[PDB]
C-alpha cells in the first residue's frame, strides 16, 4: 500500500522523480553523480569547496538576498557531499513548491562563485579541517579508505588535503562545476505533499537548461599512534560487493546479527561496484586486542555456524530499520535521489521485503564465507593502539583452523 | 589454480587432508626415487 515512486526524464537527462504523500511539507532535492571519486588529485577539494560556495549567491540572486528568500518561506536548506554523490535539498511547505524548485535551479546552474567569498570559504574550510582532525571516527574512516583503496581515487577524502584547499581558483571550480554537473547525471527528487505533474512542469520550466555532456581493494593497514588520546578507534573492513549486487541485502542481515568495546558499529559502505564491509569500535587501550578477537570470532561464527533464529532476528531488525517510508521526508527523498543515481530506479519496499524473506541461514553463511572468510582486511587505528595486533594476527583471526 | 584454493585450501580441514594424503604418497616416491638415485650413484659398488 506504499505509493510508488514515479520517474520521468527530460530531454536533458535529468530524471525528475517524485513520491507524493499527504504530509504538507516536502523535501525537494537535486542529487548529482559527482564526488571525490571523480576528482583527479589536482582538484581534490573542488566538490567540498563548491558545496561551501553554492549558498553564497548566484547571478540572478546576488549574495545573502538568495538566502533571504529561503528564510522568507521558512524553508530549510541543506547540502552534503560523499565520495560518489552530491546533494542539495530543501525542506519546505507544499504551497511553496515552485519557488523552491527555482531556487534549486540557481544552485545547480547560474551559480556565482565570488572571488571574495573564495578566500572566506577557504579560511572556513581550512580551519574546519585544521579542527576536523578532532573527530576521531572521521579520521579512522578516512584512514581506512586510504589504506584500503591506495593508489585509486577512492582513497582521497571528500575534503581534500589542505594543500589543494589553499590552491584552488574560480576557474578550477568552474571546471568541476561545468564538468561534473551534467544533466544526465542529475536527479530532481521530491518527497511528500507534491504532485508529479506540477513538479515535472516546474523542471521543464527551470532546470531544463542543464548541459548534456575500476577500484582495487588493497588489503592493508594504517595506524596513527598518538598515546595522549584517552580512547582508541579501530576500524576493520573487507571488500564490499557494490550497489547493484543483491547479496548486500544478505550482508545487511549479517550486520543486523552483530548490531566489549564501548562503541561497536557495523557498516556496509557501498560505491559503484565496490565498498567497505566491516566494524568500527572505540576502546581503551588495554581492551583493544580482546575486542578484535571477540569481533573476529563473531564474523567467523556467522561464516562457520549460524542458526535459524538469529537470522530471523536480523531479517526482522533490518526490516524495521530498512523501513524508511514515512520515516521522514528528508530521508524519503534522499532515498529517491540515491536510488535513481545508483540503481537507476527506485526499488519499492515490497521488493526489499521479498529480498529479505528469501534470505535464510544457508545462503547467509555462504555469502559471509564469500566475503569474510580468509580475506585480507584493511585496518585503520588511531589513538593508544600499541596493543592493537599487527597484520599477521588479524589475518590469522580471519579464519579458523 | 582457484579450484585448488577453492576446493583444497579453503576448508582448513581439507588443507590438512590434502597434506595428509600427500604425505602418505610422498614417502613412496621420495624413498624409491632417492633409493634408485642412490643405487645409480653407487651403481656397481653394492651387495647385489
Amino acid at each position: 500500500s506504499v505509493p510508488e515512486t514515479q520517474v520521468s526524464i527530460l530531454d536533458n537527462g535529468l530524471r525528475v522523480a517524485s513520491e507524493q504523500s499527504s504530509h504538507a511539507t516536502c523535501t525537494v532535492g537535486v542529487w548529482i553523480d559527482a564526488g571525490s571519486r571523480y576528482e583527479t588529485e589536482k582538484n581534490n577539494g573542488a566538490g567540498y569547496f563548491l558545496e561551501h560556495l553554492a549558498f553564497k549567491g548566484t547571478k540572478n540572486r546576488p549574495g545573502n538576498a538568495l538566502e533571504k528568500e529561503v528564510e522568507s518561506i521558512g524553508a530549510h536548506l541543506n547540502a552534503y557531499s560523499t565520495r560518489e554523490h552530491t546533494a542539495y535539498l530543501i525542506k519546505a511547505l507544499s504551497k511553496d513548491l515552485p519557488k523552491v524548485v527555482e531556487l534549486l535551479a540557481d544552485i545547480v546552474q547560474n551559480s556565482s562563485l565570488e572571488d571574495s567569498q573564495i578566500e572566506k570559504e577557504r579560511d572556513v574550510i581550512l580551519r574546519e579541517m585544521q579542527e576536523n582532525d578532532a573527530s576521531m571516527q572521521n579520521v579512522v574512516f578516512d584512514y581506512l579508505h586510504a589504506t584500503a583503496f591506495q593508489g585509486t581515487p577512492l582513497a582521497q577524502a571528500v575534503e581534500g588535503p589542505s594543500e589543494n584547499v589553499r590552491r584552488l581558483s574560480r576557474t578550477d571550480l568552474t571546471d568541476y562545476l561545468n564538468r561534473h554537473y551534467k544533466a544526465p547525471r542529475m536527479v530532481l527528487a521530491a518527497a511528500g505533499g507534491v504532485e508529479h505533474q506540477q513538479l515535472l512542469d516546474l523542471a521543464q520550466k527551470h532546470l531544463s537548461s542543464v548541459s548534456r555532456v575500476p577500484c582495487r581493494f588493497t588489503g592493508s593497514e594504517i595506524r596513527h599512534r598518538d598515546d595522549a588520546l584517552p580512547l582508541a578507534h579501530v576500524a576493520i573492513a573487507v571488500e564490499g560487493p557494490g550497489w547493484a549486487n543483491p547479496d548486500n541485502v544478505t550482508l545487511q542481515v549479517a550486520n543486523a546479527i552483530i548490531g566489549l568495546c564501548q562503541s561497536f558499529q557495523t557498516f556496509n559502505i557501498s560505491y559503484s561496484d565496490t565498498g567497505l564491509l566491516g566494524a568500527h569500535f572505540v576502546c581503551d587501550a588495554m581492551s583493544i586486542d580482546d575486542m578484535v578477537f571477540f569481533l573476529q570470532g563473531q564474523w567467523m561464527r556467522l561464516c562457520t555456524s549460524a542458526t535459524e533464529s538469529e537470522v530471523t532476528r536480523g531479517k526482522n531488525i533490518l526490516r524495521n530499520a530498512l523501513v524508511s517510508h514515512l520515516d521522514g521526508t528528508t530521508p524519503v527523498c534522499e532515498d529517491i535521489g540515491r536510488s535513481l543515481l545508483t540503481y537507476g530506479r527506485r526499488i519499492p519496499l515490497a521488493e526489499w521485503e521479498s529480498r529479505i524473506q528469501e534470505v535464510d541461514a544457508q545462503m547467509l553463511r555462504d555469502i559471509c564465507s564469500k566475503y569474510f572468510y580468509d580475506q585480507c582486511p584493511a585496518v585503520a587505528g588511531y589513538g593508544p593502539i600499541e596493543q592493537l595486533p599487527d597484520y599477521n594476527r588479524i589475518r590469522s583471526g580471519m579464519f579458523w583452523l | 589454480p582457484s579450484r585448488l584454493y577453492s576446493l583444497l585450501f579453503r576448508r582448513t580441514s581439507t588443507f590438512a587432508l590434502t597434506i595428509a594424503v600427500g604425505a602418505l604418497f610422498f614417502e613412496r616416491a621420495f624413498d624409491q626415487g632417492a633409493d634408485a638415485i642412490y643405487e645409480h650413484i653407487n651403481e656397481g659398488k653394492l651387495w647385489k
Binding site: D133, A155, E239 | -
Partner: peptide, 24 residues
C-alpha cells in the same frame, strides 16, 4: 590533518582482485 598525505607508494613492493585473490 589526516588528508595531508596519501598512502606511500608500495608499488615497488606491490605484486603484479578477487579473480587473483584465490590465485595469490
Amino acid at each position: 590533518s589526516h588528508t595531508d598525505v596519501k598512502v606511500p607508494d608500495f608499488s615497488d613492493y606491490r605484486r603484479a582482485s578477487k579473480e587473483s585473490s584465490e590465485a595469490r
